[PDB]
Enzyme design. Structure first.
Site, PDB file in Angstrom:
ATOM      1  N   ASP A  45       0.852  -1.179   0.000  1.00  0.00           N
ATOM      2  CA  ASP A  45       0.000   0.000   0.000  1.00  0.00           C
ATOM      3  C   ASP A  45       0.890   1.233   0.000  1.00  0.00           C
ATOM      4  O   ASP A  45       1.913   1.287   0.695  1.00  0.00           O
ATOM      5  CB  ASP A  45      -0.941   0.040   1.208  1.00  0.00           C
ATOM      6  CG  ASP A  45      -1.719   1.355   1.293  1.00  0.00           C
ATOM      7  OD1 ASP A  45      -1.837   2.040   0.254  1.00  0.00           O
ATOM      8  OD2 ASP A  45      -2.174   1.723   2.403  1.00  0.00           O
ATOM      9  N   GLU A  72       2.229   0.104  -7.116  1.00  0.00           N
ATOM     10  CA  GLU A  72       1.689   1.208  -7.894  1.00  0.00           C
ATOM     11  C   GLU A  72       2.812   2.084  -8.428  1.00  0.00           C
ATOM     12  O   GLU A  72       3.821   2.285  -7.737  1.00  0.00           O
ATOM     13  CB  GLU A  72       0.746   2.044  -7.030  1.00  0.00           C
ATOM     14  CG  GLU A  72       1.218   2.134  -5.600  1.00  0.00           C
ATOM     15  CD  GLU A  72       0.478   3.176  -4.815  1.00  0.00           C
ATOM     16  OE1 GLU A  72      -0.157   2.811  -3.803  1.00  0.00           O
ATOM     17  OE2 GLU A  72       0.516   4.354  -5.220  1.00  0.00           O
TER      18      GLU A  72
END
Lengths: 700, 703
Positions: free
Chosen positions: A342, A378
């Site tokens: 995350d 990401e």
């Protein structure tokens, strides 16, 4: 009452059949006490004296599991020097394999008196805080066949551990919301019928209910704010919290690998629940403040670059160690199949302020345990120039943010280029090259936990997060979402079936695109968060999952019969994505793919820049599949024909090649038409297509 | 054939029960062929096409262990750009876990035409090179009781595989100088009887006999020029070279570990045997020259800090992977218990002029396999600042060169400061702490393969490496030694006993000095090389171990002297303190209760100005056998008899006085020609004088 010196490795709670070896790091503590907690609330302090690598350690026989243990560190209390040790607070083992209880918020857990942040608090932190546990490390993974499902055979599913099973009227209310309610056959079977190969849970790392949150009636629900990375989160444990949860999550992983579904637990290493100064003092700030947290050039304040509050020190080798030791523990001991970092964008930034970024992807790519699992993250951009790294581990993948933002910005009404749209169905060959210099996949998603859910995605144009209490300023602002005619639910059946096929489009786009499709949990049943797109503290009916009893059922058997199509036809899942060769195909009658106008012809040189790239006809061939199989077998399949209408006014398309095609999917009819049988077509013949709708044809 | 996809991990040839999965890293090759070699020199080209992360890989079912393979790489030959690829040179897999053959030196293996160094050669190097071989990794470690002996118990023994068991009249001719001969009950007998707790193996990674030596009558006997860091050196196996050498080694560590003896193997990492340019193109130059070697300033040439040719680009991403994957393949596949880093000084000068140095001592720190094993190496002085690394792997040790240079200077007669010798016996507190900010040990040694041997250390003043053919300019120039009356072998008995009694001083000092000791193969018998102190090129009688017969009077006495000094140490804790003298001072609080106390020949406690003695010849160290403040394995107070060390590095008789009302029983005397540790002892009074011959030692014992 019997103390042996023992060993310095491994750090934490490790039980040798009839003993226990305790190890705690600190390079700036004076004396460390290991306080063996009794059930009656009494401390049996054993000073730890053998010093190796600034790690005090001692071994206590006859101390069996379930034994509650903490640490007390006497150290200098100088917030001028980054020295915030305190003997009163009973610290937590950062290698706690399990933790009992919940944070009971009071004056005691704070480690400074509320009036003065540079003063020393000497309240006992013991009853209010949590409590680390000596985990029995035996477990019988009976036939624990590691599902090595490939990327080009994977269907991920993002689901929450409490929000999933809280309302299934099939599980005992005992197991509702818990890890075992995860491994219930009916639930393990709901995915099997969907056809998912990868369960990506949310943080099961144990987290802390924010003080300023519970005092608002809310509670951290997602929980990307943890304290101990070696333990299952205990409020998801219906088998208790005295170490039994570790047998819970383990009994739930083996049952998943029973039905061959991978586990991908979510991992946060970008901040700690102790937060910035003025936070609590629970594990790290107490043991050794200046070598767990990155301190400003005033040691009194912690540099939060985001809103988190603090960031770990990614240069102090003992912090690098807790991360690789954390990742390894799950892969090997809890048998987990991959991770997902995350805020890997905030994570991958932090290193590059200590030069240590590209030296970390070397650590990843060398280690044998952590390399060969899925790492999902990401994209980021650091310093100046970009990623600024040479070798991405050849399993390291990104959530494609420019595909959803490209798909969402298609059926909404605004334009993406036909170039933007060509490269996205293609599997983002332009951003993620398989080289071994870039991430090698794209995790295509139309929706996740952040931003709307698929239902809310076509029902709102602004958020309705006033329920979060953050003044409505939180959450993704431009969700790139069109509400289909009115905001909120309205009775009007004309628009209510409009949305019902807008999601029939959002799901079909995701499944035929090259790459790795990911579903958020609840978008089969049409889950609604009341327009809330950031439901992080909504531990209630907002992000619970309503289980169906027809409208919500048509979409379930839409998705479940669509995923069949992905698993069954190899032109939609090419082992090497279209990384090598063009999106148009080198134009002839052999290419794997060739794009067409609704009018009929092929796109051309100055046709690819069509601003209004609303309509398209994509032909994928079933014999140009230039990849060998598991055993050198040429994988073959039928040819398909896609026809997109991201344009309101009904369009008439023309099927080329004169060959009998069969319509296998049609968004526009209400009964859902992956399963509902369809008619044959001639090819060449003018067909009409409904507004904002898709159609797919089939031929060998 | 029949070609399947396969995987990319693990790099190298791996047997699947029914297949073999090849993979090779070459981030600049343009296309890679795999060559399955039969016996009748037939290359079956199989074009590896799958490309993940610049690893070309394919799976070949039915390929079995023992099948010979190699790589052929089609890449541009532009040394002005640095690429030295050539499709015509049959490369080797850097991960090959067993290699067969030998360099057959000619024009074909070098990769350039013997006229121009910058041009392109087209000679088939398939019948002149070695050949990698697929290996079966199954083995039966029934009960591998990994002898995880702690650093204070470790008695390390530096042997050479050939040089240990070549001239043993107990082994069959089959097993003389091999790995299976290492597993003999005889040698394992003599390793146990001696009391060694870890055998150190001279280079065992397969190495290339330098062409400079093979056309010279000589050969690389030690082996510090390695090529494949994953294979047992084929020339040490008496079972076979098509893979089977893995099956010796494992059954060899197997037999050693059953005896309680660790295996610490020596590794040659600072350089690769392809070396600098004008060197044979064997494994890596052809695959990918940029991402293995440290080219700089000009592409064609190799930054030569190693002094032995090519360095290895310590920042390269797959150079870190190759080293780390090579370290732990021996700990979790060959069951090794520790390592030794040849030229760790230089390797740290290669790792730091890329600024990957600190990044490595963190990479060893976390890794559970490389951290938790014995790590032995060299001190260094890097760039600007010496160590310049933060926190060592807290099993990291050095070869205490300021120990040998300090004890050699002593029994030869030079004035090493009475503090410089205090700390050396003491546990070398000053250079080696235990925090983690410095090596947590002080590995001591009087001699080793570098420098003289122990009977040579006491017989020659200058090197005699003429037989090396390097014109005697090679070797340690001043070995800080003394020839004891006549340089060479003398008939004078007054000399002949001085040596074998100096040799008793050197061995006994070692076995009482704190930290971690070490011997080299031959000193228990007193092996002579003829004054040859760098015998890297003597693969002949110069460095084989002579085994004493039965009627060999003198040599058997040194062996019975050595076999009982280890006894005296394995039997009394005071000579090995778990935490060595690391917190305390080298004096202790000069009162009734101290682990240590330093007295005079004349019998008084030395003063602080008396801690500045240039002519520091005579000494008496008291160790209190009741002042051991270190816990047991279970928390016991470890208590002992008290000991009394008396030293005389002088050249006349000096009369010592026993400092301690009570009684002492002399347990070690060096001047005794029968050898005292295997003898009895008189009783000294407790204040009475003793006459002590020059260059002699005396230890007394009392509970």
């Amino acid at each position: 009452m019997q103390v042996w010196p023992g060993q310095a490795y491994p750090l934490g709670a490790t039980y040798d059949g009839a003993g226990t070896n305790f190890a705690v790091f600190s390079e700036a503590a004076h004396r460390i006490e290991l306080c063996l907690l009794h059930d009656d609330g009494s401390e049996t302090a054993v000073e730890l004296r053998e010093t190796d690598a600034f790690v005090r350690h001692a071994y206590l026989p006859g101390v069996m599991p379930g034994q509650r243990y903490g640490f007390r560190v006497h150290g200098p209390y100088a917030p001028e020097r980054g020295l915030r040790c305190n003997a009163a607070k009973l610290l937590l083992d950062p290698y706690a394999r399990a933790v009992s209880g919940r944070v009971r918020w009071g004056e005691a857990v704070y480690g400074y008196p509320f009036g003065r942040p540079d003063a020393r608090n000497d309240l006992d932190s013991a009853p209010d805080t949590m409590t680390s546990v000596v985990v029995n490390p035996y477990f019988d993974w009976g036939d624990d066949r590691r599902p090595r499902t490939e990327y080009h055979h994977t269907v991920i599913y993002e689901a929450h551990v409490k929000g999933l099973t809280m309302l299934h009227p099939d599980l005992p209310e005992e197991l509702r919301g818990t890890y075992a309610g995860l491994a219930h056959p009916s639930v393990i079977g709901h995915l099997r019928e969907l056809g998912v190969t990868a369960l990506e849970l949310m943080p099961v790392h144990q987290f802390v209910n924010d003080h300023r949150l519970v005092d608002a009636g809310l509670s951290n629900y997602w929980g990307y704010n943890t304290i101990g990375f070696f333990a299952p989160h205990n409020a998801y444990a219906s088998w208790g919290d005295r170490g039994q949860q570790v047998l819970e999550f383990k009994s739930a992983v083996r049952a998943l690998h029973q039905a061959g579904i991978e586990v991908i637990l979510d991992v946060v290493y970008n901040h700690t629940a102790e937060g910035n100064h003025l936070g609590p003092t629970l594990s790290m700030r107490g043991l050794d403040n200046p070598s767990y947290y990155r301190l400003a050039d005033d040691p009194r304040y912690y540099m939060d670059t985001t809103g988190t509050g603090n960031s770990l020190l990614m240069r102090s080798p003992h912090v690098l160690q807790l991360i690789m030791d954390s990742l390894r523990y799950w892969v090997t001991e809890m048998h987990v199949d991959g991770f997902r970092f995350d805020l890997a964008a905030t994570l991958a930034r932090q290193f590059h302020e200590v030069d240590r970024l590209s030296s970390f992807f070397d650590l990843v790519q060398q280690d044998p345990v952590v390399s060969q699992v899925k790492l999902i993250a990401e994209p980021w951009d650091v310093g100046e120039g970009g990623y600024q790294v040479g070798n991405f581990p050849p399993l390291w993948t990104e959530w494609n943010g420019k595909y959803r933002d490209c798909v969402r910005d298609l059926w909404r009404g605004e334009p993406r280029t036909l170039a933007e749209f060509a490269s996205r169905l293609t599997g983002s060959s332009d951003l993620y090259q398989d080289d071994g210099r870039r991430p090698l996949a794209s995790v295509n998603f139309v929706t996740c936990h952040d931003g709307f859910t698929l239902r809310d995605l076509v029902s709102y144009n602004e958020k309705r997060n006033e329920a979060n209490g953050e003044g409505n300023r939180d959450g993704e602002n431009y969700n790139r979402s069109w509400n289909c005619g009115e905001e909120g639910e309205t009775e009007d059946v004309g628009i209510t079936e409009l949305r019902a096929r807008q999601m029939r489009n959002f799901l079909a786009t995701l499944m035929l695109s090259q790459g790795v499709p990911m579903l958020s949990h609840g978008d089969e049943f049409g889950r609604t968060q009341g327009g809330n797109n950031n439901a992080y503290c909504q531990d209630n009916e907002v992000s619970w999952v309503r289980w169906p009893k027809e409208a919500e059922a048509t979409l379930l058997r839409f998705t479940r019969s669509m995923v069949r199509l992905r698993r069954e036809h190899p032109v939609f899942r090419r082992r090497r994505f279209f990384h090598g060769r063009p999106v148009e195909g080198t134009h002839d009658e052999l290419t794997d793919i060739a794009w067409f106008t609704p009018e009929g012809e092929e796109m051309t040189s100055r046709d690819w820049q069509a601003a209004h790239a609303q309509a398209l006809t994509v032909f994928l061939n079933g014999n140009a599949i230039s990849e060998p199989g598991t055993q050198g077998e040429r994988i073959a399949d039928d040819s398909f024909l896609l026809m997109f209408n991201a344009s309101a006014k009904e369009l008439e398309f023309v099927v080329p090649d004169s060959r009998y095609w069969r319509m296998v999917v049609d968004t526009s009819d209400p009964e859902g038409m992956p399963p509902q049988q369809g008619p044959e077509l001639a090819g060449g013949e003018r067909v009409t297509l409904a507004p904002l709708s898709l159609t797919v044809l089939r031929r060998p």
